[PDB]
């Protein structure tokens, strides 16, 4: 128990949970100071690619 | 993977997350770093230097 437990803990260890839903959310961020025109255009650009 | 490789534009750094999990992360007022420092003052000019 002691022998197997010791090298079996030193293995991977990553952040806690993740819940995957059916549909997914896409957040892409850019620099601040963008116009409601370009930012809207930007939104359409990506959506057509998606 | 295909989406992150297809949908992408200059300056626009892409990111993908779950809807519900995101919404939680959103309205979440707080700090992500395990250690944070709040330098408060009277005039922004001074604290920003701190």
């Amino acid at each position: 128990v002691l022998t197997v437990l010791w090298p079996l803990n030193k293995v991977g260890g990553e952040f806690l949970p993740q819940i995957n839903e059916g549909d997914l959310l896409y957040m892409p961020s850019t620099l601040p100071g963008i116009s409601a025109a370009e930012a809207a255009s930007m939104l359409q650009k990506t959506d057509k690619l998606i | 993977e295909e989406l992150d490789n297809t949908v992408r534009l200059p300056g626009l750094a892409n990111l993908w997350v779950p809807p519900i999990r995101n919404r939680i992360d959103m309205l979440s007022t707080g700090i992500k770093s395990p250690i944070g420092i709040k330098v408060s003052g009277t005039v922004l000019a001074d604290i920003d230097a701190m």
Partner: peptide, 26 residues
């Protein structure tokens, strides 16, 4: 590595009211 092509121009097929040019008096 996606050479996926896309139309840059603005696009609208979900709500655009159109009218026809006419000849008549004011």
């Amino acid at each position: 590595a996606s050479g996926v092509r896309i139309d840059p121009t603005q696009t609208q097929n979900l709500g655009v009211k159109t009218a026809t040019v006419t000849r008549g008096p004011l």
